[PDB]
Design a binder for this molecule. Structure first.
Ligand SMILES: *[C@@H]1O[C@H](CO)[C@@H](O[C@@H]2O[C@H](CO)[C@@H](O)[C@H](O)[C@H]2NC(C)=O)[C@H](O)[C@H]1NC(C)=O
Ligand SMILES: *[C@@H]1O[C@H](CO)[C@@H](O[C@@H]2O[C@H](CO)[C@@H](O)[C@H](O)[C@H]2NC(C)=O)[C@H](O)[C@H]1NC(C)=O
Ligand SMILES: *[C@@H]1O[C@H](CO)[C@@H](O[C@@H]2O[C@H](CO)[C@@H](O)[C@H](O)[C@H]2NC(C)=O)[C@H](O)[C@H]1NC(C)=O
Ligand SMILES: *[C@@H]1O[C@H](CO)[C@@H](O[C@@H]2O[C@H](CO)[C@@H](O)[C@H](O)[C@H]2NC(C)=O)[C@H](O)[C@H]1NC(C)=O
Ligand SMILES: *[C@@H]1O[C@H](CO)[C@@H](O)[C@H](O)[C@H]1NC(C)=O
Ligand SMILES: *[C@@H]1O[C@H](CO)[C@@H](O)[C@H](O)[C@H]1NC(C)=O
Ligand SMILES: *[C@@H]1O[C@H](CO)[C@@H](O)[C@H](O)[C@H]1NC(C)=O
Ligand SMILES: *[C@@H]1O[C@H](CO)[C@@H](O)[C@H](O)[C@H]1NC(C)=O
Ligand SMILES: *[C@@H]1O[C@H](CO)[C@@H](O)[C@H](O)[C@H]1NC(C)=O
Ligand SMILES: *[C@@H]1O[C@H](CO)[C@@H](O)[C@H](O)[C@H]1NC(C)=O
Ligand SMILES: *[C@@H]1O[C@H](CO)[C@@H](O)[C@H](O)[C@H]1NC(C)=O
Ligand SMILES: *[C@@H]1O[C@H](CO)[C@@H](O)[C@H](O)[C@H]1NC(C)=O
Ligand SMILES: *[C@@H]1O[C@H](CO)[C@@H](O)[C@H](O)[C@H]1NC(C)=O
Ligand SMILES: *[C@@H]1O[C@H](CO)[C@@H](O)[C@H](O)[C@H]1NC(C)=O
Ligand SMILES: *[C@@H]1O[C@H](CO)[C@@H](O)[C@H](O)[C@H]1NC(C)=O
Ligand SMILES: *[C@@H]1O[C@H](CO)[C@@H](O)[C@H](O)[C@H]1NC(C)=O
Ligand SMILES: *[C@@H]1O[C@H](CO)[C@@H](O)[C@H](O)[C@H]1NC(C)=O
Ligand SMILES: *[C@@H]1O[C@H](CO)[C@@H](O)[C@H](O)[C@H]1NC(C)=O
Lengths: 418, 203, 426, 149, 50
């Protein structure tokens, strides 16, 4: 019987609070498919194989071959729109600065390899892990893989040098150790917590990026979502091709046998079974490609949304831009999709403390302006709620509202006056 | 006496080239890991078709006889291999149980293992074979082999029973089964799955 | 215009046809067998077999001219089941089996696949998917009491089964065994043939069965072979297997028993020439989507044509090697020609500048109407910008603009409803 | 050409109905595509064979139309769910989601009705004329490090 | 009446499966919808068409 997870009776009580004292910066990979392999099929050359005797019978069925060419063309053009809306959110090709003075953060594995397409190191791992002519054809995408890699590099160079500003207006340069203080402040952790830990934070980030390379190099199992898009189109095409070999009730599945062995009036009856079977086989393919295209479009709309919110911004949507409090993310290209490296803050090393909703001073209730009251057992402090940094309680750490007697669970203390 | 068949007795099912491909076929085949009868000759049932094999050293085995009565009363296939050729007849005549009329067809054409297959299809007799060196003793050896066709006879004879013409040799019986065949780059069968053998083979 | 059913066309790229390299030669090859098959030794054989013990001759290793047999007006029927008899001279077979027997003429109706009748039940049975011909004629020169047929059996016989059992069939339990009696009957009796009998008169019958195996063929029509062509798109026939393609010399390691080869798709991919043991590869003659690049018809009648996936060296001979016309082959023999990863593009000037993508082509190429002519170029992703980063410089906006950007979204289709019974049955 | 989205909703449905209608004129291998020809010219015992071809083709024609409209209705429903969301978040509030309510920072938006759809006029702030400055992440006054609130 | 969404998921599966089963009773132009009738009223050459 499967286990739903380890059980945990939380150590709850009405005057106890637990506050973290350290953190781990964490990089989470996330993978989304963005476009199918663009395909088109000539229904006359598929059904009739360059026989005019067959092609004349197919005219009696009217609009179907025109209607199927229209359906597949509508899918094929949409794959260029899906591929465009995800990557092409940036209006100028921002170029990376020469010197890499990013306050200790080391982007060299996600920025371009200069020796090459101009893919990053990780984009080369992502390209390596992911893997007839009966009138079926495969078309090229509009954007080439080098253009895709220039878009990911432009998005990345904007994100590194200018924060969110390149989405909302003109890109404004900002030093990276200042951008991260804005991102820390965005999750409700005071700016000084970055600078007082900057070397540790840079090492945690650099090491976390290193573990992505080890993970991606070691196992193929992460990229399953992209490899499935390839596998489904491979099985769909092979099933559509092998259904040419079926009889559907005709004397042979090879159309030249029928035309060589039989006179017209007999031959036409046999051919019309193959037309009926091959036409139904082609409608069954096109119907599943229309449904499969809507599934990939829904994923491409989600990827376009994650690129606007997580890359060009900093989203507060819980568990949207990776688990933990979100800091930023970096796009990397992959065949038929996109990979996000979500950087997140996760709190750690909690301690128990006694707590109270308010403090009585001179007969009046005080409440903290930001964060919570706590005691270590002998002294009372206020702290920001996301990372333990106790302060002496003062009239400017706090605000006041009325007499003591209303508040359920208030405690007596001195409040200091500056 | 007995030995396990291992995977031996696969053969090219048709006169077609295919390469670097897995192909699935239904045909009469020896079940993998079946129980082949082994002999130090007696007359045996032929069933749906026969796998026959023997170990070379001194060329004691020189032919076969097939039929229902064999020794006259109805036509019988006789096969011999001697001096410079294979020789074949379908006589309704009679002969001794050892080496030295209505012959409606005629044809002319331990250190080793020699393998043969016999079955009744289109024209209604077929022969396939393989011939390779060995160092295993007094058993049918493990490892893969694929028998090439020799001949198709248009002869229409009815067979239920057979006997060897004169040591170690082996007999096994074909059954209708589905196989998955690994054709390599040189269009050579190099591995196979017997789909009925076990749930993994069926997978 | 004719593809869109419209006299005006909007700016864009439109698929309009599939281009196909048309074949220039026709090749016929067969084994050169000089022997003629002995059909006279069947239709003019001295005395035919009974229907209970019918005679089969395998017929082999020859040319056969079935049209001569088909022209024998003595044959009151020449009906064929998986072939039409005029076509026989076009074919070649891995074997032929001729079955010879005699009946009263009225019974000929039973000599067909899947029928009911005592000949079909107890004497001679074709399988329900038979491939061959049935031939019959009256034969009063045979008129005589030798012509046995079977009147009873314990069960019906199988396809091409035959039964020379001369038993006294016990219809009941009683083992009368050597003499007839109640519920124990001798099952063979014979027609008394005399000119005084018309369906009671003697008729000769021949049934021809054809065999169409994967092995090399054996009995061929009289159609004479011709010479072989390589590296060109040709119509072809080997042993009655037929198609169109580029034949080549090929290296494939066929084992000596293998006659032809197949791809991963199971398509025919190579053959061995019937008159010389060389393996020929077979490749399709080149094909690909024709698409037309146009500015709007309100702006120009100039166009460019993209032959998708096709190599530019294969296109220009489309004068006869595709579905073209004299003014249309100008977009084949003349103007500018430009190879791209998407295919060969004809009638547009390649340009070394880059611009925003106006009409998309594929693989990073786009086209437009400009200084005038249609051009083709690699698309531009926008202006490059080295952001002026350094570890201590910031830029801050001194001013702003309000903006108002329109966004449009669909919300409802038209509420159509259809009465299926009135649509279908009016 | 600004209304290309809404004009496609019209054109796609006009093509769907015209293809469905034109298919009534197809023979599908029957004697004629007008049912009153068959019913005039032929005995019932023969006419059944012709009429069953017309039924088989017309039913497959209609199943194809309905199946495409189920798929197209799901695409329009995805747009209606997105439009209902933009009206709740952009109009009835102030979204803080980047590029959801137009480019720039969202101030407010106004809905307008349109044929088969809706139009939003997203009002957004865009910063417009920067200058360079020197910067430093903290100021030390007397030994104490100061950060901006 | 509040749980109408969940009750539709139940009803749509039931209505779909009942219709898929009921379609076994339909003729589709054949002589019968009971397969053994075709196998017992006709010879092979007719029965295969039906
Ligand atoms: C940034 O990180 C990369 C690895 O993520 C460092 O590259 C390694 O550099 C050392 C020499 O300094 C070599 O021994 C390794 O083989 C390099 N690894 C790879 C994959 O090339 C790089 O030195 C770091 N750079 C900075 C400026 O911190
Ligand atoms: C609770 O926190 C306060 C402040 O950190 C601790 O009080 C200090 O204790 C040290 C000796 O351990 C003295 O030198 C300081 O002068 C004290 N400061 C004050 C404001 O009195 C206190 O020890 C802590 N108590 C517990 C139980 O951990
Ligand atoms: C907080 O301190 C006040 C005094 O500063 C406490 O109020 C007194 O409580 C006792 C009983 O514990 C009464 O007898 C006195 O009359 C109260 N004095 C006044 C001025 O009201 C108060 O109880 C303390 N709060 C808590 C939660 O213990
Ligand atoms: C901020 O930008 C606006 C334009 O967006 C400036 O307004 C223009 O000012 C000039 C005079 O300098 C007038 O001729 C224009 O008609 C004004 N435009 C509008 C729309 O009123 C404004 O001056 C700028 N302010 C600063 C401090 O740079
Ligand atoms: C916080 O955690 C890191 C390891 O992640 C450790 O090296 C560091 O010493 C810890 N700091 C404190 C104050 O606990
Ligand atoms: C808090 O303290 C109790 C014991 O007093 C202990 O059981 C519990 O695990 C502690 N919880 C945390 C978050 O450390
Ligand atoms: C906490 O709740 C318990 C009842 O579960 C009560 O006895 C206790 O006095 C409460 N403590 C505070 C500080 O409110
Ligand atoms: C072979 O057959 C004999 C019985 O004739 C049986 O005892 C023996 O176990 C079988 N061996 C194998 C390997 O199946
Ligand atoms: C083959 O011949 C034997 C007797 O020689 C007989 O028992 C058997 O039924 C025959 N098989 C067939 C298929 O005729
Ligand atoms: C094979 O054996 C027969 C006698 O059984 C003999 O006549 C013949 O010559 C031998 N074959 C050859 C090729 O010599
Ligand atoms: C061949 O068989 C027939 C009977 O089938 C018999 O009459 C004839 O005498 C036989 N001839 C020889 C040489 O065995
Ligand atoms: C194919 O056969 C040749 C010898 O004919 C051999 O050299 C080659 O290695 C074979 N290929 C494979 C994949 O074994
Ligand atoms: C066919 O004719 C040619 C020329 O006469 C000859 O070389 C070839 O060997 C003949 N074919 C056969 C099967 O011998
Ligand atoms: C049979 O003989 C007649 C002459 O008696 C001849 O016209 C006919 O062509 C012959 N048929 C065959 C198949 O030999
Ligand atoms: C053609 O369309 C353009 C807009 O694309 C317009 O400016 C021009 O006036 C039109 N010309 C004609 C002759 O319709
Ligand atoms: C086009 O065909 C020629 C044939 O010689 C070949 O050399 C060339 O590489 C081909 N180019 C492309 C792009 O297919
Ligand atoms: C365009 O580029 C090609 C090589 O890519 C060169 O031969 C040609 O001279 C160039 N023309 C111009 C005007 O740059
Ligand atoms: C900011 O100053 C640098 C000094 O080198 C200059 O290159 C850059 O163009 C300036 N940018 C702006 C926005 O004034």
């Amino acid at each position: 019987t499967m286990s739903l997870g380890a059980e945990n009776s939380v150590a709850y009580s009405n005057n106890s609070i637990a506050i973290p004292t350290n953190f781990t910066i964490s990089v989470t990979t996330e993978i989304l498919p963005v476009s199918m392999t663009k395909t088109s099929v000539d229904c006359t050359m598929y059904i009739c194989g360059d026989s005019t005797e067959c092609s004349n019978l197919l005219l009696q069925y009217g609009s179907f071959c025109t209607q199927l060419n229209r359906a597949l063309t509508g899918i094929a053009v949409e794959q260029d729109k899906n591929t465009q809306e995800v990557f092409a959110q940036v209006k100028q090709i921002y170029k990376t600065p020469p010197i890499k003075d990013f306050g200790g953060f080391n982007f060299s594995q996600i920025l371009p390899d200069p020796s090459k397409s101009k893919r990053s190191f990780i984009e080369d791992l992502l390209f390596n892990k992911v893997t007839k002519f009966n009138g079926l054809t495969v078309l090229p995408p509009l954007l080439t893989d080098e253009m895709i890699a220039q878009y990911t590099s432009a998005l990345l160079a904007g994100t590194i040098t200018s924060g969110w500003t390149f989405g909302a207006g003109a890109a404004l340069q900002i030093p990276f150790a200042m951008q991260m203080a804005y991102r820390f402040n965005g999750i409700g952790v005071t700016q000084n917590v970055l600078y007082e830990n900057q070397k540790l934070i840079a090492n945690q980030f650099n090491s976390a990026i290193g573990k992505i390379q080890d993970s991606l190099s070691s196992t193929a199992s992460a990229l399953g979502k992209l490899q499935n898009v390839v596998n489904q189109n491979a099985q769909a095409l092979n099933t559509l091709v092998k259904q040419l070999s079926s009889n559907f009730g005709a004397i042979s599945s090879v159309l030249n046998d029928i035309l060589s062995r039989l006179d017209k009036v007999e031959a036409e009856v046999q051919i019309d079974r193959l037309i009926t079977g091959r036409l139904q086989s082609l409608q069954t393919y096109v119907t599943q490609q229309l449904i499969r295209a809507a599934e990939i479009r829904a994923s491409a709309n989600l990827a376009a949304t994650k690129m606007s919110e997580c890359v060009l911004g900093q989203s507060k949507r819980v568990d949207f831009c990776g688990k933990g409090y979100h800091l930023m993310s970096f796009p990397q290209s992959a065949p038929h999709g996109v990979v996000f490296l979500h950087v997140t803050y996760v709190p750690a090393q909690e301690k128990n403390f006694t707590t109270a909703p308010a403090i009585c001073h001179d007969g009046k209730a005080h409440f903290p302006r930001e964060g919570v009251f706590v005691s270590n057992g002998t002294h009372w402090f206020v702290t920001q709620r996301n990372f333990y940094e106790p302060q002496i309680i003062t009239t400017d750490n706090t605000f006041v509202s009325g007499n003591c007697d209303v508040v359920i669970g208030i405690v007596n203390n001195t409040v200091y006056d500056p | 006496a007995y030995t396990n068949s291992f995977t031996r007795g696969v053969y090219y099912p048709d006169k077609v080239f295919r390469s670097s491909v897995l192909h699935s076929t239904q045909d009469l085949f020896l079940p993998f890991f079946s129980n082949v009868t082994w002999f130090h000759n007696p007359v045996l049932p032929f069933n749906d078709g026969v796998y026959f094999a023997s170990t070379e050293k001194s060329n004691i085995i020189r032919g076969w006889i097939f039929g229902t009565t064999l020794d006259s009363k109805t036509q019988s296939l006789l096969i011999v291999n001697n001096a410079t050729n294979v020789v074949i007849k379908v006589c309704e005549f009679q002969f001794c149980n050892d080496p030295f009329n209505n012959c409606t067809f005629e044809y002319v054409s331990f250190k080793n293992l020699r393998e043969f297959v016999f079955k009744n299809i289109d024209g209604y007799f077929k022969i396939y074979s393989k011939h390779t060196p060995i160092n295993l003793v007094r058993d049918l050896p493990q490892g893969f082999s694929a028998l090439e066709p020799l001949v198709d006879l248009p002869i229409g004879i009815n067979i239920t029973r057979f006997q060897t013409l004169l040591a170690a040799y082996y007999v096994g019986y074909l059954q209708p089964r589905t196989f998955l065949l690994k054709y390599n780059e040189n269009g050579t069968i190099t591995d196979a799955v017997d789909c009925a053998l076990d749930p993994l083979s069926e997978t | 215009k004719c593809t869109l059913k419209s006299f005006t066309v909007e700016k864009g790229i439109y698929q309009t046809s599939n281009f196909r390299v048309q074949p220039t030669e026709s090749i016929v090859r067969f084994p050169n067998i000089t022997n003629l098959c002995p059909f006279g030794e069947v239709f003019n054989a001295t005395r035919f077999a009974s229907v209970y013990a019918w005679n089969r001759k395998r017929i082999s290793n020859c040319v056969a001219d079935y049209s001569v047999l088909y022209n024998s007006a003595s044959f009151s029927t020449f009906k064929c089941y998986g072939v039409s008899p005029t076509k026989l001279n076009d074919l070649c077979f891995t074997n032929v089996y001729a079955d010879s027997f005699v009946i009263r003429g009225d019974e000929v109706r039973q000599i067909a696949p899947g029928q009911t009748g005592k000949i079909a039940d107890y004497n001679y049975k074709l399988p329900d998917d038979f491939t061959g011909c049935v031939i019959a004629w009256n034969s009063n020169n045979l008129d005589n009491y030798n012509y046995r047929y079977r009147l009873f059996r314990k069960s019906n016989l199988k396809p091409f089964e035959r039964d020379i059992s001369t038993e006294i069939y016990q219809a009941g339990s009683k083992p009368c065994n050597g003499v007839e009696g109640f519920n124990c009957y001798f099952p063979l009796q014979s027609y008394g043939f005399q000119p005084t009998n018309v369906g009671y008169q003697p008729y000769r019958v021949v049934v021809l069965s054809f065999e169409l195996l994967h092995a090399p063929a054996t009995v061929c029509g009289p159609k004479k072979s011709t010479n072989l062509v390589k590296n060109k798109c040709v119509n072809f026939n080997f042993n009655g297997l037929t198609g169109t393609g580029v034949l080549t010399e090929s290296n494939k390691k066929f084992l000596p028993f293998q006659q032809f080869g197949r791809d991963i798709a199971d398509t025919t991919d190579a053959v061995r020439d019937p008159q010389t043991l060389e393996i020929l590869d077979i490749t399709p003659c080149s094909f690909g989507g024709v698409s037309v690049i146009t500015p709007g018809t309100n702006t120009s009648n100039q166009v460019a044509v993209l032959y998708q996936g096709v190599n530019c060296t294969e296109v220009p001979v489309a004068i006869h090697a595709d579905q073209l016309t004299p003014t249309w082959r100008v977009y084949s023999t003349g103007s500018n020609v430009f190879q791209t990863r998407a295919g060969c593009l004809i009638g547009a000037e390649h340009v070394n500048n880059s611009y925003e993508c106006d009409i998309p082509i594929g693989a990073g190429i786009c086209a437009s109407y400009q200084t005038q002519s249609i051009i083709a170029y690699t698309m531009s992703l926008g202006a490059e910008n080295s952001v002026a980063y350094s570890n201590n410089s910031i830029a801050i906006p001194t001013n702003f603009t309000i903006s108002v950007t329109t966004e449009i979204l669909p919300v409802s289709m038209t509420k159509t409803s259809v009465d299926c019974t009135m649509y279908i049955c009016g």
